[PDB]
mmCIF file of C-alpha atoms in Angstrom:
data_model
loop_
_atom_site.group_PDB
_atom_site.id
_atom_site.type_symbol
_atom_site.label_atom_id
_atom_site.label_comp_id
_atom_site.label_asym_id
_atom_site.label_seq_id
_atom_site.Cartn_x
_atom_site.Cartn_y
_atom_site.Cartn_z
ATOM 1 C CA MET P 1 9.604 -25.018 28.997
ATOM 2 C CA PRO P 2 13.227 -23.839 28.542
ATOM 3 C CA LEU P 3 14.461 -24.536 25.016
ATOM 4 C CA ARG P 4 17.854 -26.235 25.409
ATOM 5 C CA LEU P 5 19.657 -24.613 22.504
ATOM 6 C CA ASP P 6 23.238 -25.792 22.070
ATOM 7 C CA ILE P 7 24.900 -22.443 21.320
ATOM 8 C CA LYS P 8 28.279 -22.821 19.580
ATOM 9 C CA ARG P 9 30.542 -19.966 18.533
ATOM 10 C CA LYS P 10 31.444 -20.443 14.817
ATOM 11 C CA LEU P 11 33.260 -17.155 14.154
ATOM 12 C CA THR P 12 34.737 -14.375 16.286
ATOM 13 C CA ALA P 13 35.794 -11.403 14.171
ATOM 14 C CA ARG P 14 37.296 -8.505 16.158
ATOM 15 C CA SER P 15 37.004 -5.196 14.301
ATOM 16 C CA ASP P 16 35.864 -1.615 14.700
ATOM 17 C CA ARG P 17 32.152 -1.020 15.548
ATOM 18 C CA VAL P 18 29.928 -3.203 13.348
ATOM 19 C CA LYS P 19 26.766 -1.353 12.220
ATOM 20 C CA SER P 20 25.290 -4.007 9.927
ATOM 21 C CA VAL P 21 25.759 -7.726 9.338
ATOM 22 C CA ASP P 22 24.446 -9.940 6.539
ATOM 23 C CA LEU P 23 24.862 -13.622 5.596
ATOM 24 C CA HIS P 24 25.483 -14.880 2.062
ATOM 25 C CA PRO P 25 22.828 -17.475 0.996
ATOM 26 C CA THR P 26 25.205 -19.959 -0.755
ATOM 27 C CA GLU P 27 28.735 -19.029 0.376
ATOM 28 C CA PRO P 28 29.955 -19.355 4.019
ATOM 29 C CA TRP P 29 30.322 -15.557 4.213
ATOM 30 C CA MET P 30 29.366 -12.896 6.715
ATOM 31 C CA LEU P 31 29.249 -9.282 5.573
ATOM 32 C CA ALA P 32 30.120 -6.728 8.277
ATOM 33 C CA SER P 33 29.845 -2.947 7.769
ATOM 34 C CA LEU P 34 32.129 -0.964 10.063
ATOM 35 C CA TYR P 35 31.947 2.472 11.663
ATOM 36 C CA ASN P 36 35.372 3.371 10.157
ATOM 37 C CA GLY P 37 33.909 3.294 6.593
ATOM 38 C CA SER P 38 35.137 -0.207 5.650
ATOM 39 C CA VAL P 39 33.055 -3.290 4.792
ATOM 40 C CA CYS P 40 34.505 -6.727 5.577
ATOM 41 C CA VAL P 41 33.576 -10.190 4.243
ATOM 42 C CA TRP P 42 34.469 -13.028 6.620
ATOM 43 C CA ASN P 43 34.472 -16.734 5.798
ATOM 44 C CA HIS P 44 32.929 -18.394 8.870
ATOM 45 C CA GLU P 45 34.207 -21.904 7.965
ATOM 46 C CA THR P 46 37.889 -20.902 7.611
ATOM 47 C CA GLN P 47 37.600 -18.040 10.163
ATOM 48 C CA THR P 48 39.447 -15.784 7.678
ATOM 49 C CA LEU P 49 38.890 -12.274 6.357
ATOM 50 C CA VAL P 50 38.233 -12.922 2.646
ATOM 51 C CA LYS P 51 37.385 -9.456 1.264
ATOM 52 C CA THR P 52 37.588 -5.834 2.405
ATOM 53 C CA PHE P 53 35.896 -2.881 0.708
ATOM 54 C CA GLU P 54 37.105 0.589 1.636
ATOM 55 C CA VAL P 55 33.907 2.530 1.031
ATOM 56 C CA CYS P 56 34.637 5.944 2.589
ATOM 57 C CA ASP P 57 36.108 7.621 5.722
ATOM 58 C CA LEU P 58 32.571 7.841 7.201
ATOM 59 C CA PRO P 59 30.467 5.147 8.959
ATOM 60 C CA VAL P 60 28.856 2.490 6.748
ATOM 61 C CA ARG P 61 25.539 1.838 8.548
ATOM 62 C CA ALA P 62 23.998 -0.531 6.009
ATOM 63 C CA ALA P 63 25.437 -3.268 3.795
ATOM 64 C CA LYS P 64 23.646 -6.158 2.019
ATOM 65 C CA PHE P 65 24.519 -9.005 -0.314
ATOM 66 C CA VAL P 66 22.801 -9.176 -3.709
ATOM 67 C CA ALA P 67 23.884 -12.762 -4.406
ATOM 68 C CA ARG P 68 22.053 -13.027 -7.799
ATOM 69 C CA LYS P 69 24.191 -10.152 -9.202
ATOM 70 C CA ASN P 70 27.432 -10.910 -7.279
ATOM 71 C CA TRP P 71 27.043 -7.509 -5.568
ATOM 72 C CA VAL P 72 27.535 -5.918 -2.188
ATOM 73 C CA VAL P 73 25.326 -2.836 -1.759
ATOM 74 C CA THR P 74 26.527 -0.328 0.859
ATOM 75 C CA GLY P 75 24.925 2.779 2.381
ATOM 76 C CA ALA P 76 27.248 5.212 4.145
ATOM 77 C CA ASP P 77 26.886 8.418 6.163
ATOM 78 C CA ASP P 78 28.205 10.296 3.052
ATOM 79 C CA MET P 79 24.625 9.816 1.651
ATOM 80 C CA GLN P 80 26.060 7.609 -1.117
ATOM 81 C CA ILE P 81 24.954 4.146 -2.112
ATOM 82 C CA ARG P 82 27.876 2.182 -3.562
ATOM 83 C CA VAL P 83 27.546 -1.139 -5.356
ATOM 84 C CA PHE P 84 30.591 -3.421 -5.492
ATOM 85 C CA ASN P 85 31.179 -6.653 -7.364
ATOM 86 C CA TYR P 86 32.415 -8.957 -4.567
ATOM 87 C CA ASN P 87 34.393 -11.162 -7.031
ATOM 88 C CA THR P 88 36.351 -8.399 -8.826
ATOM 89 C CA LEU P 89 36.206 -5.830 -5.955
ATOM 90 C CA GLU P 90 35.193 -3.282 -8.616
ATOM 91 C CA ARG P 91 32.761 -0.456 -7.861
ATOM 92 C CA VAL P 92 29.870 -1.120 -10.262
ATOM 93 C CA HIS P 93 27.799 1.939 -9.367
ATOM 94 C CA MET P 94 27.699 4.943 -7.012
ATOM 95 C CA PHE P 95 24.967 7.548 -6.481
ATOM 96 C CA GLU P 96 23.592 9.981 -3.882
ATOM 97 C CA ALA P 97 20.442 8.321 -2.521
ATOM 98 C CA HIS P 98 19.359 10.626 0.310
ATOM 99 C CA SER P 99 19.977 14.108 1.741
ATOM 100 C CA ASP P 100 21.002 12.636 5.144
ATOM 101 C CA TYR P 101 22.471 9.408 6.628
ATOM 102 C CA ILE P 102 21.404 6.068 5.138
ATOM 103 C CA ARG P 103 20.251 3.831 8.035
ATOM 104 C CA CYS P 104 18.995 0.673 6.327
ATOM 105 C CA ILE P 105 18.954 -1.107 2.956
ATOM 106 C CA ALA P 106 16.396 -3.796 2.086
ATOM 107 C CA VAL P 107 16.878 -5.825 -1.119
ATOM 108 C CA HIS P 108 13.772 -7.172 -2.831
ATOM 109 C CA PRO P 109 14.093 -11.005 -3.022
ATOM 110 C CA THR P 110 12.861 -11.424 -6.656
ATOM 111 C CA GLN P 111 12.538 -7.966 -8.279
ATOM 112 C CA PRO P 112 15.435 -5.573 -9.206
ATOM 113 C CA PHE P 113 14.491 -3.279 -6.296
ATOM 114 C CA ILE P 114 16.339 -1.814 -3.340
ATOM 115 C CA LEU P 115 14.578 0.057 -0.559
ATOM 116 C CA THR P 116 16.641 2.625 1.367
ATOM 117 C CA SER P 117 15.753 4.448 4.590
ATOM 118 C CA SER P 118 17.410 7.631 5.813
ATOM 119 C CA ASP P 119 17.588 10.286 8.524
ATOM 120 C CA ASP P 120 15.904 12.540 5.872
ATOM 121 C CA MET P 121 12.610 10.865 7.008
ATOM 122 C CA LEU P 122 12.190 9.311 3.532
ATOM 123 C CA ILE P 123 12.164 5.773 2.206
ATOM 124 C CA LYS P 124 13.150 5.450 -1.478
ATOM 125 C CA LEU P 125 12.712 2.597 -3.963
ATOM 126 C CA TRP P 126 15.520 2.151 -6.524
ATOM 127 C CA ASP P 127 15.275 0.031 -9.695
ATOM 128 C CA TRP P 128 18.695 -1.221 -10.875
ATOM 129 C CA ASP P 129 17.394 -2.497 -14.246
ATOM 130 C CA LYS P 130 16.317 1.128 -14.935
ATOM 131 C CA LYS P 131 19.853 2.513 -14.332
ATOM 132 C CA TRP P 132 19.216 2.885 -10.562
ATOM 133 C CA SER P 133 16.296 5.293 -11.073
ATOM 134 C CA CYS P 134 14.260 6.255 -8.011
ATOM 135 C CA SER P 135 10.913 4.588 -8.814
ATOM 136 C CA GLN P 136 9.093 5.712 -5.668
ATOM 137 C CA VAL P 137 9.494 7.869 -2.545
ATOM 138 C CA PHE P 138 7.630 6.946 0.654
ATOM 139 C CA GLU P 139 6.818 10.002 2.769
ATOM 140 C CA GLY P 140 5.064 10.058 6.143
ATOM 141 C CA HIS P 141 7.615 9.477 8.912
ATOM 142 C CA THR P 142 8.357 12.601 11.010
ATOM 143 C CA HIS P 143 11.788 11.468 12.262
ATOM 144 C CA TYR P 144 14.714 9.203 11.222
ATOM 145 C CA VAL P 145 13.713 5.904 9.593
ATOM 146 C CA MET P 146 16.015 3.477 11.399
ATOM 147 C CA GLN P 147 15.096 0.156 9.778
ATOM 148 C CA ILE P 148 12.996 -1.262 6.940
ATOM 149 C CA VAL P 149 12.068 -4.906 6.283
ATOM 150 C CA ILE P 150 10.205 -6.527 3.380
ATOM 151 C CA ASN P 151 7.405 -8.925 4.298
ATOM 152 C CA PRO P 152 8.744 -12.428 3.431
ATOM 153 C CA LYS P 153 5.136 -13.659 2.808
ATOM 154 C CA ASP P 154 4.073 -10.693 0.647
ATOM 155 C CA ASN P 155 7.079 -9.064 -1.034
ATOM 156 C CA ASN P 156 4.896 -6.085 -2.089
ATOM 157 C CA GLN P 157 4.641 -5.038 1.579
ATOM 158 C CA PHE P 158 7.326 -3.693 3.862
ATOM 159 C CA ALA P 159 7.457 -2.302 7.381
ATOM 160 C CA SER P 160 9.430 0.719 8.612
ATOM 161 C CA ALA P 161 10.573 1.633 12.124
ATOM 162 C CA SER P 162 11.185 5.300 12.963
ATOM 163 C CA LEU P 163 12.385 7.465 15.841
ATOM 164 C CA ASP P 164 8.933 9.146 15.546
ATOM 165 C CA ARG P 165 7.758 6.216 17.787
ATOM 166 C CA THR P 166 5.732 4.701 14.952
ATOM 167 C CA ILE P 167 5.885 1.615 12.797
ATOM 168 C CA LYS P 168 4.423 2.075 9.317
ATOM 169 C CA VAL P 169 3.492 -0.726 6.936
ATOM 170 C CA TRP P 170 3.755 0.272 3.296
ATOM 171 C CA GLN P 171 2.839 -1.284 -0.007
ATOM 172 C CA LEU P 172 4.986 -1.021 -3.133
ATOM 173 C CA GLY P 173 2.916 1.129 -5.446
ATOM 174 C CA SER P 174 1.356 3.257 -2.633
ATOM 175 C CA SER P 175 2.677 6.677 -1.568
ATOM 176 C CA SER P 176 0.710 6.349 1.700
ATOM 177 C CA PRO P 177 1.264 3.758 4.461
ATOM 178 C CA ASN P 178 -1.407 1.016 4.675
ATOM 179 C CA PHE P 179 -1.468 1.541 8.440
ATOM 180 C CA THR P 180 0.567 2.924 11.357
ATOM 181 C CA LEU P 181 1.307 1.031 14.591
ATOM 182 C CA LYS X 1 -26.457 19.742 10.448
ATOM 183 C CA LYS X 2 -28.745 17.893 8.011
ATOM 184 C CA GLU X 3 -28.392 14.170 8.577
ATOM 185 C CA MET X 4 -28.656 12.003 5.453
ATOM 186 C CA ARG X 5 -28.954 8.206 5.406
ATOM 187 C CA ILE X 6 -27.016 6.582 2.555
ATOM 188 C CA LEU X 7 -27.068 2.879 1.700
ATOM 189 C CA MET X 8 -23.895 1.648 -0.013
ATOM 190 C CA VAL X 9 -24.367 -1.708 -1.747
ATOM 191 C CA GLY X 10 -22.888 -3.776 -4.570
ATOM 192 C CA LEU X 11 -21.296 -7.159 -5.230
ATOM 193 C CA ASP X 12 -18.584 -8.612 -3.011
ATOM 194 C CA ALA X 13 -15.025 -7.325 -3.579
ATOM 195 C CA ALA X 14 -16.426 -4.160 -5.305
ATOM 196 C CA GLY X 15 -14.387 -2.070 -2.777
ATOM 197 C CA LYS X 16 -17.375 -0.649 -0.744
ATOM 198 C CA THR X 17 -15.599 -0.912 2.617
ATOM 199 C CA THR X 18 -12.402 0.618 1.126
ATOM 200 C CA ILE X 19 -14.456 3.601 -0.136
ATOM 201 C CA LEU X 20 -16.148 4.014 3.288
ATOM 202 C CA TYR X 21 -12.892 4.099 5.279
ATOM 203 C CA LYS X 22 -11.071 6.191 2.618
ATOM 204 C CA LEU X 23 -13.810 8.831 3.023
ATOM 205 C CA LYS X 24 -13.729 8.659 6.869
ATOM 206 C CA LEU X 25 -10.049 8.044 7.715
ATOM 207 C CA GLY X 26 -8.379 9.178 4.475
ATOM 208 C CA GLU X 27 -6.505 5.825 4.488
ATOM 209 C CA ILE X 28 -6.670 2.603 2.457
ATOM 210 C CA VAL X 29 -7.966 -0.211 4.659
ATOM 211 C CA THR X 30 -7.145 -3.709 3.406
ATOM 212 C CA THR X 31 -10.580 -5.273 3.768
ATOM 213 C CA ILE X 32 -11.630 -8.888 3.948
ATOM 214 C CA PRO X 33 -15.094 -9.504 2.339
ATOM 215 C CA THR X 34 -17.557 -7.738 4.648
ATOM 216 C CA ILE X 35 -19.681 -10.265 6.557
ATOM 217 C CA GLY X 36 -22.528 -7.944 7.531
ATOM 218 C CA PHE X 37 -22.481 -4.147 7.563
ATOM 219 C CA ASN X 38 -20.290 -1.220 8.529
ATOM 220 C CA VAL X 39 -21.844 2.089 9.527
ATOM 221 C CA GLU X 40 -19.878 5.323 9.504
ATOM 222 C CA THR X 41 -20.757 8.994 9.638
ATOM 223 C CA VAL X 42 -18.957 11.134 7.043
ATOM 224 C CA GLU X 43 -19.220 14.920 7.174
ATOM 225 C CA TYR X 44 -19.194 16.825 3.904
ATOM 226 C CA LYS X 45 -20.242 20.514 3.391
ATOM 227 C CA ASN X 46 -22.225 20.666 6.714
ATOM 228 C CA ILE X 47 -24.213 17.543 5.773
ATOM 229 C CA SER X 48 -23.692 14.488 7.982
ATOM 230 C CA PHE X 49 -23.816 11.399 5.765
ATOM 231 C CA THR X 50 -24.540 8.198 7.680
ATOM 232 C CA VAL X 51 -23.236 5.618 5.192
ATOM 233 C CA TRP X 52 -24.287 1.970 5.582
ATOM 234 C CA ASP X 53 -21.831 -0.392 3.862
ATOM 235 C CA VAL X 54 -23.759 -3.683 3.571
ATOM 236 C CA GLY X 55 -21.847 -6.769 2.427
ATOM 237 C CA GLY X 56 -22.252 -7.919 -1.176
ATOM 238 C CA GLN X 57 -21.874 -11.683 -0.700
ATOM 239 C CA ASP X 58 -24.639 -13.901 -2.142
ATOM 240 C CA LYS X 59 -25.873 -14.839 1.368
ATOM 241 C CA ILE X 60 -26.111 -11.153 2.396
ATOM 242 C CA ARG X 61 -27.765 -9.724 -0.784
ATOM 243 C CA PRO X 62 -31.278 -10.913 0.343
ATOM 244 C CA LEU X 63 -30.738 -8.904 3.568
ATOM 245 C CA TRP X 64 -30.262 -5.551 1.751
ATOM 246 C CA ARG X 65 -34.088 -5.104 1.881
ATOM 247 C CA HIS X 66 -33.933 -4.581 5.668
ATOM 248 C CA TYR X 67 -31.846 -1.390 5.097
ATOM 249 C CA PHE X 68 -34.034 0.187 2.364
ATOM 250 C CA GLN X 69 -36.332 1.933 4.848
ATOM 251 C CA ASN X 70 -35.494 5.648 5.401
ATOM 252 C CA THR X 71 -32.696 5.495 2.755
ATOM 253 C CA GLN X 72 -32.360 8.921 1.079
ATOM 254 C CA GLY X 73 -29.412 8.052 -1.180
ATOM 255 C CA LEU X 74 -28.252 4.770 -2.732
ATOM 256 C CA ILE X 75 -24.563 4.276 -3.606
ATOM 257 C CA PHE X 76 -24.057 1.313 -5.937
ATOM 258 C CA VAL X 77 -20.380 0.291 -6.149
ATOM 259 C CA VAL X 78 -19.278 -1.693 -9.213
ATOM 260 C CA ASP X 79 -15.898 -3.312 -9.793
ATOM 261 C CA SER X 80 -15.098 -1.871 -13.224
ATOM 262 C CA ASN X 81 -12.488 -4.635 -13.713
ATOM 263 C CA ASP X 82 -15.006 -7.478 -13.099
ATOM 264 C CA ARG X 83 -16.451 -7.869 -16.615
ATOM 265 C CA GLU X 84 -17.971 -11.302 -15.814
ATOM 266 C CA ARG X 85 -20.179 -10.117 -12.916
ATOM 267 C CA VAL X 86 -21.374 -6.834 -14.513
ATOM 268 C CA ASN X 87 -24.618 -8.503 -15.626
ATOM 269 C CA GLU X 88 -25.167 -9.857 -12.089
ATOM 270 C CA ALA X 89 -24.566 -6.327 -10.739
ATOM 271 C CA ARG X 90 -27.167 -5.027 -13.256
ATOM 272 C CA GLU X 91 -29.800 -7.574 -12.173
ATOM 273 C CA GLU X 92 -29.236 -6.844 -8.474
ATOM 274 C CA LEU X 93 -29.342 -3.050 -9.085
ATOM 275 C CA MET X 94 -32.568 -3.376 -11.135
ATOM 276 C CA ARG X 95 -34.123 -5.580 -8.407
ATOM 277 C CA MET X 96 -33.288 -2.963 -5.732
ATOM 278 C CA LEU X 97 -34.582 -0.085 -7.917
ATOM 279 C CA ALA X 98 -37.945 -1.912 -8.263
ATOM 280 C CA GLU X 99 -38.514 -1.661 -4.455
ATOM 281 C CA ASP X 100 -41.097 1.000 -3.478
ATOM 282 C CA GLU X 101 -39.096 1.968 -0.328
ATOM 283 C CA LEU X 102 -36.218 3.153 -2.614
ATOM 284 C CA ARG X 103 -38.516 5.055 -5.007
ATOM 285 C CA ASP X 104 -37.402 8.522 -3.856
ATOM 286 C CA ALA X 105 -33.741 7.512 -3.278
ATOM 287 C CA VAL X 106 -31.066 9.285 -5.346
ATOM 288 C CA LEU X 107 -28.753 6.814 -7.150
ATOM 289 C CA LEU X 108 -24.978 7.336 -7.221
ATOM 290 C CA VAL X 109 -22.992 4.677 -9.122
ATOM 291 C CA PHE X 110 -19.279 4.398 -8.322
ATOM 292 C CA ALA X 111 -17.340 2.789 -11.176
ATOM 293 C CA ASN X 112 -14.580 1.711 -8.797
ATOM 294 C CA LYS X 113 -11.044 0.352 -9.506
ATOM 295 C CA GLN X 114 -10.547 2.624 -12.554
ATOM 296 C CA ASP X 115 -6.812 2.420 -11.708
ATOM 297 C CA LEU X 116 -6.764 -1.122 -13.168
ATOM 298 C CA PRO X 117 -5.723 -1.349 -16.855
ATOM 299 C CA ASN X 118 -8.647 -3.629 -17.906
ATOM 300 C CA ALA X 119 -11.276 -1.534 -16.113
ATOM 301 C CA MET X 120 -14.439 -0.666 -18.033
ATOM 302 C CA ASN X 121 -14.871 3.091 -18.406
ATOM 303 C CA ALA X 122 -17.828 4.934 -16.826
ATOM 304 C CA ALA X 123 -19.663 5.093 -20.197
ATOM 305 C CA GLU X 124 -19.334 1.303 -20.773
ATOM 306 C CA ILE X 125 -20.587 0.657 -17.221
ATOM 307 C CA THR X 126 -23.526 3.078 -17.812
ATOM 308 C CA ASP X 127 -24.604 1.051 -20.870
ATOM 309 C CA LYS X 128 -24.009 -2.375 -19.237
ATOM 310 C CA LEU X 129 -26.015 -1.363 -16.126
ATOM 311 C CA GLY X 130 -28.750 0.161 -18.368
ATOM 312 C CA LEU X 131 -28.780 3.443 -16.358
ATOM 313 C CA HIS X 132 -30.157 5.380 -19.368
ATOM 314 C CA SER X 133 -33.362 3.248 -19.117
ATOM 315 C CA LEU X 134 -34.118 4.662 -15.633
ATOM 316 C CA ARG X 135 -37.034 7.109 -15.716
ATOM 317 C CA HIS X 136 -38.049 9.501 -12.918
ATOM 318 C CA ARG X 137 -34.823 8.756 -10.961
ATOM 319 C CA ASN X 138 -31.901 11.099 -10.390
ATOM 320 C CA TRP X 139 -28.735 9.109 -11.040
ATOM 321 C CA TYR X 140 -25.047 9.903 -11.520
ATOM 322 C CA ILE X 141 -22.066 7.723 -12.412
ATOM 323 C CA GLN X 142 -18.593 8.660 -11.190
ATOM 324 C CA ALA X 143 -15.350 6.934 -12.133
ATOM 325 C CA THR X 144 -13.529 6.199 -8.852
ATOM 326 C CA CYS X 145 -10.285 4.803 -7.558
ATOM 327 C CA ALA X 146 -10.847 3.879 -3.894
ATOM 328 C CA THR X 147 -7.086 3.465 -3.336
ATOM 329 C CA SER X 148 -6.124 6.971 -4.560
ATOM 330 C CA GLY X 149 -9.471 8.494 -3.530
ATOM 331 C CA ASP X 150 -9.946 9.985 -7.015
ATOM 332 C CA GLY X 151 -13.587 10.728 -7.957
ATOM 333 C CA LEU X 152 -14.968 9.937 -4.436
ATOM 334 C CA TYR X 153 -15.412 13.593 -3.441
ATOM 335 C CA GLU X 154 -16.948 14.543 -6.840
ATOM 336 C CA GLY X 155 -19.547 11.788 -6.319
ATOM 337 C CA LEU X 156 -20.295 13.036 -2.768
ATOM 338 C CA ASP X 157 -20.549 16.637 -4.024
ATOM 339 C CA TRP X 158 -23.191 15.576 -6.583
ATOM 340 C CA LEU X 159 -25.048 13.601 -3.882
ATOM 341 C CA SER X 160 -24.941 16.545 -1.432
ATOM 342 C CA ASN X 161 -26.345 18.948 -4.049
ATOM 343 C CA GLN X 162 -29.138 16.529 -5.066
ATOM 344 C CA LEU X 163 -30.192 15.802 -1.457
ATOM 345 C CA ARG X 164 -30.102 19.541 -0.609
ATOM 346 C CA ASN X 165 -32.558 20.381 -3.414
ATOM 347 C CA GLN X 166 -35.018 17.530 -2.643
ATOM 348 C CA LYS X 167 -36.666 19.335 0.360
#
């Protein structure tokens, strides 16, 4: 039976090409990463642009809120991950994560972990409590890893989608995928 | 190729099915408790090992006797982290080893889950299972991690050499 969803437009933000969007859990904010290398925070209640981060001159393909730390984590085509405090607009940290474009960032919901996927065919786990050390590298995709998502029911598992035509499900703590779809 | 029939038994959650598919597919299969048996053929050094993974649940343990016939090698898998059920694993192993149909069967014990920090070492499992009390039986204990695959091939290499010399 057709679900009668009342679809209302809350915000319309015209900008350059948006490559990632994220929603803040407590604040009425939308994060938008742009192809021009900027990251914008929109308030969807006031319909106003609240914050803008100029990351680099290159496309920012991934951006995520880390609400518990007051951070915005960005991954750009310059192979750099940049961490910004969204209150002070200060750059907290910056490091080279991958040898090619960063496609996706997944933030672990409870642990101090960020997963990053890249066109280098790798997925890397970063621990921010250990000075952003790479704790693990996941190898096994044969093409660009376009998106990664943590299992909301089992935060030790995540899935990856790749241009190799495969989906791999991985476990934190395993260098090999649990299975391939 | 010489075909060898191997029975793989042990308590539930010992990781038997994980060992079987790690040997065959090279991958870690997340297994639910095996309700019944799995049968897979594993090739190692021109010997075809037909491995029977029979479930270790209390309801299935009485049914292990139906698989003893024509068994040339017995693999007993022990959860080296399960200190509470080690005595139960000893009783079940000793009960199987008393069967006349298994008299000529070579015993390989896999001390599995050695990757866990509270795992008993292979020597502690050897004493707790009483393997040193076994007379006239060729046995070997190998520390294994079914998830990494460490020690699985060393155990199979011992088994292949024993079964090659028995004819």
